[PDB]
Amino acid sequence: MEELTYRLFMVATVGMLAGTVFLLASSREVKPEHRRGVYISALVCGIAWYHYQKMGASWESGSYDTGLRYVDWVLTVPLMFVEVLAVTRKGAAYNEAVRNWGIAATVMIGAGYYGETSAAGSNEYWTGFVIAMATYVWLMRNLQAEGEGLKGDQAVAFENIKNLILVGWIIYPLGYIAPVVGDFDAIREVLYTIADIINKVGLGVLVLQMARVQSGE
Ligand SMILES: *C/C=C(C)/C=C/C=C(C)/C=C/C1=C(C)CCCC1(C)C
């Protein structure tokens, strides 16, 4: 439904802003040396807040720009890896992973955009899919490895961060392939919007929880 897609854009706008202000307000409840991930988490929700306002306006206007979603992803998806690295690493090791995982995440979204902006089932579509899927798997394997050697409450807090991404991000590549299986355009927009709220606000809340554990909570 077209009115549903629009209503969900408005629910996402409000959920993203609620997440932004929750995370900024909660940042003071954790120690300064563990705040970086909470701040980056709030920034991700704030960018998505701005983009969901623009998507809702674009939609109601009758000129829905499918590119707004990818501008949001190319910014927020690398930052989401960064907000996780901000609680698992510091110093040189953090900067190294921010560069390496951040570039990988940008390539994944860029390959997706290359494929999305072609005829469905076209060669460009499949090139995009394979390069983005390969980078996705590479990132999910890096995330699995990031947990190795963690202990006690930090191992449990990291498991939750890792599994939100592992389970919660499957919908994105699933949605991409859907249109070659049939007509799933309207449902894909709805499911991506719900997924974005859960993934972005949920990951920020779990990064906050890791930062609380690390602060001695
Ligand atoms: C806040 C938004 C998020 C976390 C969006 C995540 C999006 C992806 C993981 C997209 C992945 C894709 C592939 C793995 C292959 C097909 C192309 C994409 C870009 C849909």
From TrEMBL:
It is a multi-pass membrane protein. The chain crosses the membrane at residues 6-25, 98-114, 126-143, 164-184, 190-208. InterPro entries: Arc/bac/fun_rhodopsins. The modification N-formylmethionine is found at residue 1. Signal peptide: none annotated. Keywords: Membrane, Transmembrane, Transmembrane helix. This is Bacteriorhodopsin. Pfam families: Bac_rhodopsin (PF01036). It is found in: Membrane. GO terms for cellular component: membrane. Belongs to the archaeal/bacterial/fungal opsin family.
